[PDB]
Design a protein around this ligand. Structure first.
Ligand SMILES: *[C@@H]1O[C@H](CO)[C@@H](O[C@@H]2O[C@H](CO)[C@@H](O[C@@H]3O[C@H](CO[C@H]4O[C@H](CO)[C@@H](O)[C@H](O)[C@@H]4O)[C@@H](O)[C@H](O[C@H]4O[C@H](CO)[C@@H](O)[C@H](O)[C@@H]4O)[C@@H]3O)[C@H](O)[C@H]2NC(C)=O)[C@H](O)[C@H]1NC(C)=O
Ligand SMILES: *[C@@H]1O[C@H](CO)[C@@H](O[C@@H]2O[C@H](CO)[C@@H](O[C@@H]3O[C@H](CO[C@H]4O[C@H](CO)[C@@H](O)[C@H](O)[C@@H]4O)[C@@H](O)[C@H](O[C@H]4O[C@H](CO)[C@@H](O)[C@H](O)[C@@H]4O)[C@@H]3O)[C@H](O)[C@H]2NC(C)=O)[C@H](O)[C@H]1NC(C)=O
Ligand SMILES: CC(=O)N[C@@H]1[C@@H](O)[C@H](O[C@@H]2O[C@H](CO[C@]3(C(=O)O)C[C@H](O)[C@@H](NC(C)=O)[C@H]([C@H](O)[C@H](O)CO)O3)[C@H](O)[C@H](O)[C@H]2O)[C@@H](CO)O[C@H]1O
Ligand SMILES: CC(=O)N[C@@H]1[C@@H](O)[C@H](O[C@@H]2O[C@H](CO[C@]3(C(=O)O)C[C@H](O)[C@@H](NC(C)=O)[C@H]([C@H](O)[C@H](O)CO)O3)[C@H](O)[C@H](O)[C@H]2O)[C@@H](CO)O[C@H]1O
Ligand SMILES: *[C@@H]1O[C@H](CO)[C@@H](O[C@@H]2O[C@H](CO)[C@@H](O[C@@H]3O[C@H](CO)[C@@H](O)[C@H](O)[C@@H]3O)[C@H](O)[C@H]2NC(C)=O)[C@H](O)[C@H]1NC(C)=O
Ligand SMILES: *[C@@H]1O[C@H](CO)[C@@H](O[C@@H]2O[C@H](CO)[C@@H](O[C@@H]3O[C@H](CO)[C@@H](O)[C@H](O)[C@@H]3O)[C@H](O)[C@H]2NC(C)=O)[C@H](O)[C@H]1NC(C)=O
Ligand SMILES: CC(=O)N[C@H]1[C@H]([C@H](O)[C@H](O)CO)O[C@@](OC[C@H]2O[C@@H](O)[C@H](O)[C@@H](O)[C@H]2O)(C(=O)O)C[C@@H]1O
Ligand SMILES: *[C@@H]1O[C@H](CO)[C@@H](O[C@@H]2O[C@H](CO)[C@@H](O)[C@H](O)[C@H]2NC(C)=O)[C@H](O)[C@H]1NC(C)=O
Ligand SMILES: *[C@@H]1O[C@H](CO)[C@@H](O[C@@H]2O[C@H](CO)[C@@H](O)[C@H](O)[C@H]2NC(C)=O)[C@H](O)[C@H]1NC(C)=O
Ligand SMILES: *[C@@H]1O[C@H](CO)[C@@H](O[C@@H]2O[C@H](CO)[C@@H](O)[C@H](O)[C@H]2NC(C)=O)[C@H](O)[C@H]1NC(C)=O
Ligand SMILES: *[C@@H]1O[C@H](CO)[C@@H](O)[C@H](O)[C@H]1NC(C)=O
Ligand SMILES: *[C@@H]1O[C@H](CO)[C@@H](O)[C@H](O)[C@H]1NC(C)=O
Ligand SMILES: *[C@@H]1O[C@H](CO)[C@@H](O)[C@H](O)[C@H]1NC(C)=O
Ligand SMILES: *[C@@H]1O[C@H](CO)[C@@H](O)[C@H](O)[C@H]1NC(C)=O
Lengths: 317, 321, 317
């Protein structure tokens, strides 16, 4: 009178399909998802310092558009620019806008240090009704619009050495008048010139008189440029007209800072990974939410699902 | 007297060598090639719309070099530029030629819409014997060479708003005269200026008088620039001399369009994948024909062969010879 | 009284840890290192031709800064630029410095061929005490500083066709005077212009008068430009002032040549792979020494060690 001893394994009534070397679909007892495909829709305000630009681009906060004055000296790990942002100061362009935005974003600070530039024989603090600050005309807070004093605008020739142990970022510009009358009325000379240099490098910009499209009452424009001055080097600014002068420099840093375009609201929560769609968990190695990310994130892939088998082959009965 | 039952497997007289984790070469019963290494030498005319440039670069077709007039308003999935292409109009350069070529190639169309620009106090439709159109002097079809009327060239100041819901591409230029006599003779003012702007952006170009190498009779040149005007924005052109004016705009699109340099002839066949060497099949995952491709193509690799084993190890009977 | 026959395998007392699919660390009898993590600290002078720049950047050797005259017509597989290099001639900048440095580095030669440019009505061979040669003033050896003859500087208009079967590299420049007095004193015309062209392309540079920081006595500058002329094409140079003229061309090659920034000393040894830290062996497939390499090198990875198991699982007694 014997006995039977059967060896076996478990099964489940409803298995999951996975891919292998030999099968595009085969059933196993269990699997887990490796692609993060959803977001909360919200950017968590920890553990990264999130700075909401609201109505302001980083560049407008940098220049000091009056409605962006609240951003003076701000810092961030991630600056968030909104699609509703608008400019409301002198109409301007930045040749290589993208590079200036990038280098400031990456620096992570708008810390500004005022310097005592001496502008001999010119009028300082020019403004416009296109850039109101309170009820009266105004200007970008970090820039100093120089014009004639009496009936002359002399050749400006000034210096600022960098005797600190950090890099200085200087933002400056050039005014493009609408007419010859505007040019001579403001700067006396019929044609201006701005040359900004360090020991190693230089930029010279010739203004261009003429009409651009009307923006906030003006066919004139300002063009924005930048110059980095390293320790031991020196800034020199040289102009006989049309200079939009720096008031000082921005302190530069290196680190983890960046910038992102997103309309996702900011919320009080914790998430290492941020996308423009909102924060996403980072327990999974891959994600299909957005190729734009910031922080400790799963890697972006095209697949919306990939199943890692966590059990044996499911052979039901 | 019992019986013997032997288990076994097949072998074949002619195996193939494959690579594994442990072996650089080991013999299996069969294998299949994963690298496409040959082409027909011909570009198949389907399923993609292939436009043969023949004697014309895309840029010459865009500007409207007379021998390229047949390309007016053309469209393509793949524009094919030939090594025999030549220019035969006013000598010109395009700063950032590569970008203009790229953005037009990618747009996939030369559809041109003429606009009623008003050029007050200048002579229109200037031409050159370097750019013959029929028996007489001519010019790029899409550009309008403005010069003095009587003894004056006034400050030109014109606008064109974009009230459409698509982007407009404007092509314009600046004429560089050979001498001061040429400059004043054509434009009166001793030095010209072209400023083209939108709300957001602006380009100002100062012409430069002097000799460049003689091309079709001329040491002068034209430089070509472009400006995209989005819906709701406006073009403004401002000049007191040397303007080579747009006659209108090109309609821009987005899609699958591109451009390829190839001398391969175009033939009647069907192939998703195109290389400069000709079309190639796409049944294999890899290819070693050319890193330049267009369409549904195998991925370019350096190996000219890679064998995927499709059978077991091939073990012939121990050899008595 | 029968017998026992035990099958077994070897072990060692002290095994090595490797990583697998299932284990972060598991012990095997032996393994071999796949990441090269050390260097000698020295650059081997074979089998690649190493040219030590010493006190000279490649660009200064190219222009012919006097202390770099020893590099005239030199060749290299790898030009090594040292952090102690300095400039000691007219102060200058190169817009797109990085591209000029790259294309020269890649050409692998400073072979210079003098051409008989005819400069009618100007004074040739201008120099400066910022660029001393012998007891007197001097200049970049490969450039010809043109100034007025008598009371005129005429429109210069010269041509040079390329009837060779190689590309010609022309280096030229533009002088930026410190003052209007300097400009008219040297060139007569109040504003200069340099136009350098080939059949298909052209560059025009307007000089900019004004002060830059003092370097070796000077607030003036030279800006350096280049033009490649292919076989069958032709150079034209046209100027009414401020031209720093080429004396000829550099003969261009294509091949394996490059440039590296390193302070590692050069030694007599053999190594295919060079990093800025020094030469490294290339018996391993990966390396963690430096992402900058030249020659037959292991691929750069972030891991400092990766162990390929060369034996079975170690199960000691
Ligand atoms: C600034 O300096 C330059 C260089 O000296 C001058 O440019 C030259 O000017 C002359 C005169 O216009 C040009 O001569 C013409 O050459 C043509 C042949 O061209 C081919 O070969 C040359 C090489 O020698 C290539 O440059 C060119 O690309 C072609 O491959 C001839 O076809 C012309 O002949 C016709 O015109 C002349 C009248 O000028 C008649 O005698 C003939 O019968 C015929 O009708 C002509 O000989 C020369 O090509 C120019 N060279 C270059 C490199 O550009 C500028 O003119 C000068 N500027 C000023 C203001 O002085
Ligand atoms: C536009 O504005 C600028 C700024 O004022 C002017 O440029 C300055 O010009 C002055 C006078 O020409 C320059 O002065 C010279 O500086 C030399 C180097 O200075 C640097 O290095 C020394 C150490 O070697 C440091 O101590 C110093 O901080 C600097 O970093 C000096 O070596 C020169 O010395 C000579 O003169 C002095 C007289 O005071 C004597 O004691 C010496 O023995 C010697 O003879 C001299 O002082 C100055 O460097 C310029 N600065 C800059 C930033 O460029 C322009 O001149 C002006 N433009 C116009 C058109 O006017
Ligand atoms: C200084 C002054 O009041 N000048 C009178 C001009 O206002 C006037 O021209 C017109 O200007 C209008 C906008 O003007 C401002 C502005 O931007 O708000 C006024 C600013 O004070 C002035 N700032 C400075 C430093 O001068 C500024 C500046 O000149 C321009 O922005 C430079 O491009 O102009 C508006 O554009 C009107 O359409 C226009 O008529 C002139 C001519 O009427 O008279 C001046 O007395
Ligand atoms: C209008 C005219 O006929 N002017 C005479 C010039 O032809 C002549 O200069 C000669 O020009 C030759 C080539 O000339 C054209 C051309 O490009 O084909 C003729 C065109 O009609 C003219 N177009 C316009 C709108 O003016 C064009 C233009 O001026 C230049 O291309 C601009 O740079 O020139 C060739 O270059 C000869 O070498 C040259 O002598 C002058 C001087 O002799 O006399 C004029 O009567
Ligand atoms: C060159 O031509 C352009 C285009 O015609 C001129 O620009 C236009 O200038 C006028 C005023 O001179 C602008 O009109 C203004 O519009 C506002 C509302 O938008 C209105 O409230 C004002 O009363 C005023 O009429 C017009 O917008 C502007 N056009 C564009 C496209 O910007 C330019 O002034 C001409 N310049 C010269 C010197 O001829
Ligand atoms: C062992 O592997 C080889 C491939 O390395 C096999 O030969 C290939 O077989 C395929 C599919 O059976 C053949 O495709 C056919 O080609 C004809 C035209 O030639 C076409 O009309 C059919 O519709 C079909 O696509 C292919 O020709 C052939 N390729 C080569 C390079 O030989 C072989 O069949 C395998 N043998 C065994 C015994 O498994
Ligand atoms: C070809 C030539 O003119 N060489 C001059 C040179 C140039 O005029 C100058 O570099 C152009 O910018 O100037 C040299 O002078 C330097 C010296 O000039 C004095 O006038 C002034 O007192 C000083 O401040 C200083 O600039 C030079 O060495 O560069 C002389 C040279 O012969
Ligand atoms: C995250 O946001 C991106 C960017 O808007 C979304 O991508 C868009 O969504 C659909 C297809 O998914 C398209 O109609 C758009 O053209 C896409 N734009 C881009 C730039 O890719 C994405 O779907 C969002 N993902 C999640 C999970 O919310
Ligand atoms: C496809 O064309 C490429 C490019 O023309 C061929 O590779 C070139 O072959 C030339 C000589 O014929 C060599 O000197 C170069 O090494 C190659 N050029 C480049 C740019 O890589 C290639 O062999 C062709 N392939 C086939 C299958 O025809
Ligand atoms: C080779 O040289 C590089 C560059 O000088 C060394 O990298 C530095 O070392 C540590 C990381 O190990 C960092 O803190 C530094 O910031 C690194 N510098 C840079 C520029 O990355 C590297 O360690 C050297 N390696 C060896 C083996 O000598
Ligand atoms: C699948 O994954 C884990 C087990 O590691 C667990 O969360 C879940 O209950 C499992 N499901 C099934 C059906 O086994
Ligand atoms: C910016 O930086 C410092 C504060 O640490 C100071 O110099 C300056 O007053 C600050 N400005 C503002 C507006 O906070
Ligand atoms: C190009 O297209 C437009 C409208 O789509 C048309 O008005 C124009 O005449 C066309 N030109 C040619 C040459 O077909
Ligand atoms: C360990 O493996 C390497 C590579 O095969 C070999 O050179 C070395 O001698 C081996 N050492 C031992 C102790 O087996």
């Amino acid at each position: 009178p014997g006995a039977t001893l059967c060896l076996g394994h478990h099964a489940v009534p409803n298995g999951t399909l996975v891919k292998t070397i030999t099968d595009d679909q085969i059933e196993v007892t269990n699997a887990t998802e490796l692609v993060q495909s959803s977001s909360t829709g919200k950017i968590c305000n920890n553990p990264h310092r999130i700075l909401d630009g609201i109505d302001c681009t980083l560049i407008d906060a940098l220049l000091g558009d009056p409605h962006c004055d609240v951003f003076q000296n701000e810092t961030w790990d991630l600056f968030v620019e909104r699609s509703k942002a608008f400019s409301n100061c002198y109409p301007y362009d930045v040749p290589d806008y993208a590079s200036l935005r990038s280098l400031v974003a990456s620096s992570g600070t708008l810390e500004f240090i005022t310097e005592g530039f001496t502008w001999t024989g010119v009028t300082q603090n020019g403004g416009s009704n296109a850039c109101k600050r309170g009820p009266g005309s105004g200007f970008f807070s970090r820039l100093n619009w120089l014009t004639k004093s009496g009936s002359t605008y002399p050749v400006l020739n000034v210096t600022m050495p960098n005797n600190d142990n950090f890099d200085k970022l200087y933002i400056w510009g050039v005014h493009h008048p609408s007419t010859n009358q505007d040019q001579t009325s403001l700067y006396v000379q019929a044609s201006g010139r701005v040359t900004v240099s360090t020991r190693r490098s230089q930029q010279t910009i010739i203004p261009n008189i003429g009409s651009r499209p009307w923006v906030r009452g003006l066919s004139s424009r300002i063009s924005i440029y930048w110059t980095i001055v390293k320790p031991g080097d020196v800034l020199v600014i040289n102009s006989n007209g049309n200079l939009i002068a720096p008031r000082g420099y921005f302190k530069m840093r290196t680190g983890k800072s960046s910038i992102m375009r997103s309309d996702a609201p900011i919320d009080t929560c914790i998430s290492e990974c941020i996308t423009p769609n909102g924060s996403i968990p980072n327990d999974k190695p891959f994600q299909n939410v957005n190729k734009i990310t910031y922080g400790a994130c799963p890697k972006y892939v095209k697949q919306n699902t990939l199943k890692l088998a966590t059990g044996m082959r499911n052979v039901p009965e």
